[PDB]
Enzyme design. Structure first.
Site, PDB file in Angstrom:
ATOM      1  N   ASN A  35      40.687   6.759 -43.273  1.00 26.34           N
ATOM      2  CA  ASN A  35      39.317   6.850 -42.792  1.00 26.34           C
ATOM      3  C   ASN A  35      38.452   7.936 -43.409  1.00 26.34           C
ATOM      4  OD1 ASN A  35      40.169   5.852 -39.970  1.00 26.34           O
ATOM      5  ND2 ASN A  35      41.589   7.628 -39.830  1.00 26.34           N
TER       6      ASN A  35
ATOM      7  N   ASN B  48      46.314   8.732 -36.009  1.00 21.07           N
ATOM      8  CA  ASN B  48      45.701   9.304 -36.815  1.00 21.07           C
ATOM      9  C   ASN B  48      46.109  10.840 -37.550  1.00 21.07           C
ATOM     10  OD1 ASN B  48      42.993  11.445 -37.078  1.00 21.07           O
ATOM     11  ND2 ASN B  48      42.558   9.496 -38.078  1.00 21.07           N
TER      12      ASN B  48
ATOM     13  N   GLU C 295      44.752  -3.025 -33.237  1.00 22.41           N
ATOM     14  CA  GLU C 295      45.079  -2.206 -34.331  1.00 22.41           C
ATOM     15  C   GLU C 295      45.648  -2.435 -35.490  1.00 22.41           C
ATOM     16  OE1 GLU C 295      43.404   0.740 -34.251  1.00 22.41           O
ATOM     17  OE2 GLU C 295      42.896   1.084 -32.350  1.00 22.41           O
TER      18      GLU C 295
ATOM     19  N   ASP D  32      37.105  10.389 -43.151  1.00 19.60           N
ATOM     20  CA  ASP D  32      37.242  11.972 -43.194  1.00 19.60           C
ATOM     21  C   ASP D  32      38.413  12.458 -44.063  1.00 19.60           C
ATOM     22  OD1 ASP D  32      39.422  11.318 -41.519  1.00 19.60           O
ATOM     23  OD2 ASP D  32      38.697  12.380 -39.644  1.00 19.60           O
TER      24      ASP D  32
ATOM     25  N   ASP E 153      45.327   6.494 -40.467  1.00 18.84           N
ATOM     26  CA  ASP E 153      46.157   5.876 -39.302  1.00 18.84           C
ATOM     27  C   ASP E 153      47.078   5.158 -39.889  1.00 18.84           C
ATOM     28  OD1 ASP E 153      43.422   6.765 -38.086  1.00 18.84           O
ATOM     29  OD2 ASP E 153      42.723   4.879 -37.830  1.00 18.84           O
TER      30      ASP E 153
END
Ligand SMILES: [Cl-]
Ligand SMILES: [Cl-]
Length: 129
Positions: free
Chosen positions: A46, A59, A35, A48, A52
């Site tokens: 991200n 998130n 990650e 949208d 993160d």
């Protein structure tokens, strides 16, 4: 902070992540590896507009507040910046809430794609735990 592999394993073990909800320590170390490359300061944005944060890439749409994710739920009740500290406590505490919400570690795409079904114990091999 960029953790070492065994350094992170021991810090995660101390914070109660070993076997938490049935996920052995190797799973958490493997997820953090893919990650964030063990970097507590990792951020990724991200599509949208959510972001993160931190070593487990938590998130902003659901779990932390970063002031710029509209419709964020802030379910861990923390500013996302707390997730970037060299003290992993806030990341660990929030991750426990995430992994408990029904979908286990499938919430972490890199865990699903790169840790699940592999020999995750290899990630703590050789560590003084
Ligand atoms: Cl393990
Ligand atoms: Cl992936």
């Amino acid at each position: 902070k960029v953790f070492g592999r065994c350094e992170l394993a021991a810090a995660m073990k101390r914070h109660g992540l070993d076997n938490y909800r049935g996920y052995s320590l190797g799973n958490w170390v493997c997820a953090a590896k893919f990650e964030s490359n063990f970097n507590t300061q990792a951020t990724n944005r991200n599509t949208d507009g959510s972001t993160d944060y931190g070593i487990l890439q938590i998130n902003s749409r659901w779990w932390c507040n970063d002031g710029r994710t509209p419709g964020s739920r802030n379910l861990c009740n923390i500013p996302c910046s707390a997730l970037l500290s060299s003290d992993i406590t806030a990341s660990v505490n929030c991750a426990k809430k995430i992994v408990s919400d029904g979908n286990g570690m499938n919430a972490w795409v890199a865990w699903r794609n790169r840790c699940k079904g592999t020999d995750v114990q290899a990630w703590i091999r050789g560590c003084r735990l």
